[PDB]
Design a protein around this ligand. Structure first.
Ligand SMILES: *C(=O)c1nc2c(C(=O)Nc3cc(NCCOC)c(C#N)cn3)cn(CCN3CCOCC3)c2cc1Br
Length: 300
Protein backbone atom coordinates (compact mmCIF):
# COMPACT_ATOMS: atom_id res chain seq x y z
CA UNK A 1 0.00 0.00 0.00
CA UNK A 2 2.74 2.43 1.20
CA UNK A 3 5.62 3.13 -1.17
CA UNK A 4 8.74 0.89 -1.13
CA UNK A 5 11.79 2.34 0.61
CA UNK A 6 14.63 -0.02 -0.33
CA UNK A 7 16.90 1.61 2.30
CA UNK A 8 14.80 0.15 5.10
CA UNK A 9 12.52 -2.53 3.66
CA UNK A 10 13.13 -6.03 5.08
CA UNK A 11 11.49 -9.19 3.62
CA UNK A 12 8.72 -10.20 6.01
CA UNK A 13 9.29 -13.89 5.42
CA UNK A 14 12.65 -13.40 7.16
CA UNK A 15 10.76 -12.75 10.43
CA UNK A 16 9.42 -15.39 12.76
CA UNK A 17 7.02 -13.68 15.24
CA UNK A 18 7.18 -14.82 18.88
CA UNK A 19 5.68 -13.73 22.22
CA UNK A 20 3.99 -10.33 22.56
CA UNK A 21 6.09 -7.84 24.53
CA UNK A 22 3.33 -5.37 25.33
CA UNK A 23 0.51 -3.14 24.05
CA UNK A 24 0.58 0.66 23.62
CA UNK A 25 -2.00 3.39 22.91
CA UNK A 26 -1.45 2.53 19.23
CA UNK A 27 -0.12 -0.91 18.31
CA UNK A 28 1.55 -3.78 20.07
CA UNK A 29 5.14 -4.99 20.22
CA UNK A 30 6.10 -8.59 19.61
CA UNK A 31 9.43 -10.40 20.15
CA UNK A 32 10.74 -11.95 16.92
CA UNK A 33 13.64 -13.79 15.28
CA UNK A 34 15.09 -12.19 12.08
CA UNK A 35 17.34 -13.98 9.55
CA UNK A 36 19.85 -11.91 7.60
CA UNK A 37 19.17 -8.53 9.21
CA UNK A 38 22.79 -8.03 8.23
CA UNK A 39 22.80 -8.60 4.44
CA UNK A 40 26.38 -9.86 4.70
CA UNK A 41 25.20 -12.77 6.84
CA UNK A 42 21.88 -13.74 5.10
CA UNK A 43 21.23 -16.84 7.24
CA UNK A 44 22.25 -15.36 10.59
CA UNK A 45 19.55 -15.26 13.27
CA UNK A 46 19.00 -12.28 15.56
CA UNK A 47 16.31 -11.31 18.06
CA UNK A 48 14.34 -8.15 17.34
CA UNK A 49 11.18 -6.42 18.52
CA UNK A 50 8.44 -5.78 15.96
CA UNK A 51 5.99 -2.87 16.30
CA UNK A 52 2.64 -3.47 14.53
CA UNK A 53 -1.04 -2.50 14.81
CA UNK A 54 -3.69 -4.20 16.97
CA UNK A 55 -6.46 -6.18 15.19
CA UNK A 56 -8.99 -3.40 15.97
CA UNK A 57 -6.86 -0.70 14.22
CA UNK A 58 -8.33 2.58 12.89
CA UNK A 59 -6.86 4.67 10.07
CA UNK A 60 -5.55 7.06 12.75
CA UNK A 61 -3.80 4.08 14.44
CA UNK A 62 -2.10 3.30 11.10
CA UNK A 63 -1.24 6.98 10.54
CA UNK A 64 0.38 7.12 14.01
CA UNK A 65 2.43 3.99 13.42
CA UNK A 66 3.52 5.28 9.97
CA UNK A 67 4.47 8.58 11.57
CA UNK A 68 6.55 6.75 14.18
CA UNK A 69 8.25 4.82 11.39
CA UNK A 70 9.15 8.00 9.56
CA UNK A 71 10.54 9.56 12.79
CA UNK A 72 12.76 6.50 13.39
CA UNK A 73 14.09 6.70 9.84
CA UNK A 74 15.20 10.29 10.47
CA UNK A 75 16.61 9.99 14.05
CA UNK A 76 19.74 7.96 13.16
CA UNK A 77 21.70 5.45 15.29
CA UNK A 78 22.65 5.94 18.97
CA UNK A 79 23.78 3.44 21.55
CA UNK A 80 21.28 4.72 24.09
CA UNK A 81 18.06 4.64 22.04
CA UNK A 82 15.97 1.78 20.63
CA UNK A 83 17.18 1.91 17.00
CA UNK A 84 15.23 1.25 13.80
CA UNK A 85 16.39 -1.97 12.05
CA UNK A 86 13.97 -2.34 9.14
CA UNK A 87 10.33 -2.15 8.05
CA UNK A 88 7.81 -4.40 6.27
CA UNK A 89 5.47 -2.29 4.19
CA UNK A 90 4.84 -4.45 1.12
CA UNK A 91 2.24 -7.15 0.64
CA UNK A 92 1.15 -7.60 4.25
CA UNK A 93 0.71 -5.75 7.55
CA UNK A 94 2.91 -2.80 8.58
CA UNK A 95 5.88 -3.89 10.69
CA UNK A 96 8.41 -1.50 12.24
CA UNK A 97 11.37 -3.64 13.32
CA UNK A 98 13.50 -2.25 16.15
CA UNK A 99 16.16 -3.46 18.58
CA UNK A 100 15.02 -5.86 21.33
CA UNK A 101 16.03 -5.09 24.94
CA UNK A 102 16.37 -8.45 26.62
CA UNK A 103 15.99 -7.31 30.25
CA UNK A 104 12.76 -5.30 29.79
CA UNK A 105 12.07 -1.79 31.13
CA UNK A 106 14.20 0.03 33.69
CA UNK A 107 11.50 0.39 36.31
CA UNK A 108 10.93 -3.38 36.62
CA UNK A 109 14.70 -3.97 36.23
CA UNK A 110 15.31 -1.89 39.36
CA UNK A 111 12.32 -3.26 41.32
CA UNK A 112 13.41 -6.86 40.67
CA UNK A 113 16.90 -6.04 41.99
CA UNK A 114 16.16 -4.31 45.28
CA UNK A 115 18.51 -5.49 47.99
CA UNK A 116 17.64 -8.34 50.42
CA UNK A 117 15.61 -7.07 53.40
CA UNK A 118 16.68 -7.80 57.03
CA UNK A 119 14.31 -10.88 57.18
CA UNK A 120 16.84 -12.93 55.11
CA UNK A 121 19.00 -15.56 56.81
CA UNK A 122 22.75 -15.02 56.11
CA UNK A 123 23.92 -17.59 53.59
CA UNK A 124 27.56 -17.25 52.59
CA UNK A 125 29.76 -14.10 52.20
CA UNK A 126 27.43 -11.79 50.21
CA UNK A 127 23.92 -12.15 51.71
CA UNK A 128 23.84 -8.39 52.36
CA UNK A 129 24.98 -7.45 48.87
CA UNK A 130 22.15 -6.67 46.45
CA UNK A 131 22.68 -6.64 42.67
CA UNK A 132 22.50 -2.84 42.38
CA UNK A 133 25.51 -0.66 43.36
CA UNK A 134 25.67 3.13 43.42
CA UNK A 135 28.01 3.42 40.41
CA UNK A 136 25.76 1.25 38.24
CA UNK A 137 22.74 3.38 39.23
CA UNK A 138 24.69 6.52 38.25
CA UNK A 139 25.73 4.89 34.97
CA UNK A 140 22.05 4.18 34.25
CA UNK A 141 21.15 7.86 34.75
CA UNK A 142 24.18 8.91 32.74
CA UNK A 143 23.23 6.70 29.79
CA UNK A 144 19.67 7.95 29.72
CA UNK A 145 20.96 11.53 29.68
CA UNK A 146 23.31 10.77 26.78
CA UNK A 147 20.46 9.18 24.87
CA UNK A 148 18.27 12.21 25.56
CA UNK A 149 21.05 14.52 24.48
CA UNK A 150 21.22 12.69 21.20
CA UNK A 151 17.44 12.80 20.71
CA UNK A 152 17.45 16.58 21.44
CA UNK A 153 20.26 17.17 18.92
CA UNK A 154 17.90 15.51 16.35
CA UNK A 155 15.09 17.86 17.44
CA UNK A 156 13.07 15.01 19.02
CA UNK A 157 11.01 15.68 22.14
CA UNK A 158 10.03 12.57 24.05
CA UNK A 159 7.05 13.94 26.09
CA UNK A 160 6.68 10.90 28.40
CA UNK A 161 10.22 10.22 29.56
CA UNK A 162 9.99 7.75 32.48
CA UNK A 163 11.76 4.60 33.82
CA UNK A 164 9.06 2.50 32.09
CA UNK A 165 10.04 4.04 28.68
CA UNK A 166 13.71 3.18 29.17
CA UNK A 167 14.68 -0.37 28.28
CA UNK A 168 17.69 -2.47 29.39
CA UNK A 169 19.75 -4.70 27.13
CA UNK A 170 21.48 -7.99 28.00
CA UNK A 171 24.55 -5.86 28.78
CA UNK A 172 22.73 -3.32 30.96
CA UNK A 173 22.86 -0.65 28.26
CA UNK A 174 20.00 1.87 28.71
CA UNK A 175 17.92 2.52 25.60
CA UNK A 176 15.22 5.17 25.37
CA UNK A 177 12.05 3.70 23.78
CA UNK A 178 8.91 5.21 22.21
CA UNK A 179 10.54 8.60 21.57
CA UNK A 180 8.90 9.12 18.20
CA UNK A 181 5.27 8.93 19.26
CA UNK A 182 2.17 10.86 18.46
CA UNK A 183 0.96 11.22 22.01
CA UNK A 184 -2.40 12.99 21.79
CA UNK A 185 -1.22 15.82 24.02
CA UNK A 186 -4.44 17.77 23.49
CA UNK A 187 -6.58 15.08 25.06
CA UNK A 188 -4.70 13.61 28.02
CA UNK A 189 -6.89 12.07 30.73
CA UNK A 190 -4.81 13.44 33.67
CA UNK A 191 -6.57 11.05 36.02
CA UNK A 192 -5.60 8.04 33.87
CA UNK A 193 -4.14 5.12 35.84
CA UNK A 194 -2.49 2.34 33.81
CA UNK A 195 -2.93 -1.41 34.23
CA UNK A 196 0.19 -1.39 36.35
CA UNK A 197 -0.89 1.54 38.49
CA UNK A 198 1.10 4.34 36.80
CA UNK A 199 -0.21 7.93 36.76
CA UNK A 200 1.67 9.45 33.74
CA UNK A 201 0.70 13.02 34.81
CA UNK A 202 3.33 12.67 37.58
CA UNK A 203 6.07 12.95 34.92
CA UNK A 204 4.75 16.06 33.16
CA UNK A 205 6.59 19.38 33.46
CA UNK A 206 4.32 22.18 34.81
CA UNK A 207 4.36 24.02 31.50
CA UNK A 208 3.26 20.80 29.78
CA UNK A 209 0.56 19.99 32.34
CA UNK A 210 -0.81 23.52 32.83
CA UNK A 211 -0.03 25.14 29.48
CA UNK A 212 0.30 22.24 26.95
CA UNK A 213 3.80 23.62 26.14
CA UNK A 214 6.53 20.98 25.44
CA UNK A 215 10.22 21.67 24.87
CA UNK A 216 13.43 19.79 25.52
CA UNK A 217 13.40 21.50 28.93
CA UNK A 218 10.08 19.81 29.77
CA UNK A 219 11.77 16.48 29.01
CA UNK A 220 14.52 17.62 31.48
CA UNK A 221 11.81 17.90 34.17
CA UNK A 222 10.70 14.33 33.33
CA UNK A 223 14.36 13.31 33.49
CA UNK A 224 14.54 14.55 37.10
CA UNK A 225 11.48 12.45 37.94
CA UNK A 226 13.31 9.52 36.28
CA UNK A 227 16.39 10.23 38.40
CA UNK A 228 14.12 9.92 41.48
CA UNK A 229 12.80 6.56 40.10
CA UNK A 230 16.35 5.29 39.69
CA UNK A 231 17.52 6.19 43.16
CA UNK A 232 14.40 4.77 44.79
CA UNK A 233 15.15 1.58 42.75
CA UNK A 234 11.91 1.75 40.81
CA UNK A 235 9.68 3.70 43.18
CA UNK A 236 6.49 5.54 42.14
CA UNK A 237 6.82 9.34 42.35
CA UNK A 238 4.80 11.61 44.69
CA UNK A 239 4.15 8.64 47.02
CA UNK A 240 0.55 8.51 48.19
CA UNK A 241 -0.43 11.68 46.34
CA UNK A 242 -3.52 11.31 44.12
CA UNK A 243 -3.87 13.46 40.99
CA UNK A 244 -6.27 16.06 42.49
CA UNK A 245 -3.66 16.75 45.19
CA UNK A 246 -0.76 16.71 42.70
CA UNK A 247 -2.46 19.66 40.88
CA UNK A 248 -2.53 21.91 43.91
CA UNK A 249 0.86 20.84 45.28
CA UNK A 250 2.40 21.75 41.93
CA UNK A 251 0.54 25.08 41.93
CA UNK A 252 2.07 25.61 45.44
CA UNK A 253 5.57 24.73 44.11
CA UNK A 254 5.85 21.40 46.04
CA UNK A 255 8.70 19.03 45.10
CA UNK A 256 9.44 15.45 46.15
CA UNK A 257 11.55 14.89 49.27
CA UNK A 258 15.10 13.65 49.04
CA UNK A 259 14.75 9.86 49.07
CA UNK A 260 16.67 7.48 51.39
CA UNK A 261 20.29 6.59 50.54
CA UNK A 262 20.55 9.18 47.86
CA UNK A 263 23.60 11.45 47.96
CA UNK A 264 22.94 15.19 47.97
CA UNK A 265 24.66 15.46 44.57
CA UNK A 266 21.85 13.46 42.97
CA UNK A 267 19.01 15.11 44.87
CA UNK A 268 20.60 18.45 43.90
CA UNK A 269 20.37 17.48 40.18
CA UNK A 270 16.75 16.38 40.70
CA UNK A 271 15.84 19.75 42.20
CA UNK A 272 17.62 21.54 39.34
CA UNK A 273 15.57 19.59 36.82
CA UNK A 274 12.43 20.69 38.69
CA UNK A 275 13.16 24.45 38.80
CA UNK A 276 9.94 26.30 37.87
CA UNK A 277 11.51 28.19 34.95
CA UNK A 278 12.44 25.85 32.11
CA UNK A 279 15.50 27.95 31.32
CA UNK A 280 16.69 27.46 34.92
CA UNK A 281 16.84 23.64 34.52
CA UNK A 282 20.08 22.16 33.20
CA UNK A 283 20.26 21.09 29.57
CA UNK A 284 20.75 17.43 28.71
CA UNK A 285 24.29 18.37 27.69
CA UNK A 286 24.88 19.82 31.16
CA UNK A 287 23.28 16.74 32.78
CA UNK A 288 25.56 14.37 30.83
CA UNK A 289 28.64 16.29 32.05
CA UNK A 290 27.45 16.53 35.65
CA UNK A 291 26.58 12.80 35.84
CA UNK A 292 29.90 12.02 34.13
CA UNK A 293 31.74 13.84 36.92
CA UNK A 294 30.01 11.70 39.52
CA UNK A 295 30.40 8.52 37.50
CA UNK A 296 34.15 9.08 37.13
CA UNK A 297 34.55 10.02 40.80
CA UNK A 298 33.08 6.69 41.88
CA UNK A 299 34.48 4.33 39.21
CA UNK A 300 38.11 4.05 40.57
C1 LIG B 1 14.30 -9.16 23.12
O1 LIG B 1 15.63 -8.63 23.22
C2 LIG B 1 13.66 -9.31 24.38
N1 LIG B 1 12.90 -8.33 24.89
C3 LIG B 1 12.27 -8.43 26.06
C4 LIG B 1 11.49 -7.55 26.75
C5 LIG B 1 11.14 -6.32 26.33
O2 LIG B 1 10.36 -5.58 26.97
N2 LIG B 1 11.75 -5.97 25.16
C6 LIG B 1 11.46 -4.86 24.46
C7 LIG B 1 10.29 -4.11 24.60
C8 LIG B 1 10.07 -3.02 23.75
N3 LIG B 1 8.97 -2.22 23.82
C9 LIG B 1 7.85 -2.53 24.72
C10 LIG B 1 8.05 -1.64 25.95
O3 LIG B 1 8.14 -0.30 25.48
C11 LIG B 1 8.55 0.69 26.47
C12 LIG B 1 11.00 -2.70 22.76
C13 LIG B 1 10.83 -1.58 21.90
N4 LIG B 1 10.70 -0.70 21.24
C14 LIG B 1 12.13 -3.45 22.63
N5 LIG B 1 12.32 -4.53 23.48
C15 LIG B 1 11.08 -8.16 27.86
N6 LIG B 1 11.64 -9.40 27.88
C16 LIG B 1 11.44 -10.37 28.99
C17 LIG B 1 12.76 -10.73 29.69
N7 LIG B 1 12.88 -10.34 31.11
C18 LIG B 1 13.95 -11.16 31.70
C19 LIG B 1 13.39 -12.36 32.46
O4 LIG B 1 12.73 -11.85 33.66
C20 LIG B 1 11.98 -10.60 33.40
C21 LIG B 1 11.64 -10.52 31.89
C22 LIG B 1 12.37 -9.57 26.77
C23 LIG B 1 13.11 -10.60 26.32
C24 LIG B 1 13.78 -10.48 25.10
BR1 LIG B 1 14.89 -11.95 24.40
Amino acid sequence: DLPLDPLWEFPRDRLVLGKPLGEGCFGQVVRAEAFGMDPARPDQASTVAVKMLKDNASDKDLADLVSEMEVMKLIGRHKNIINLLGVCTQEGPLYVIVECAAKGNLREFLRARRPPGPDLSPDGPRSSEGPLSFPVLVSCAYQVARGMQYLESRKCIHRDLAARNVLVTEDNVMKIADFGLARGVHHIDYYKKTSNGRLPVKWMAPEALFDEVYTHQSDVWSFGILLWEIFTLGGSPYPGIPVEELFSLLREGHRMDRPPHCPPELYGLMRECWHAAPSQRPTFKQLVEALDKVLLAVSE
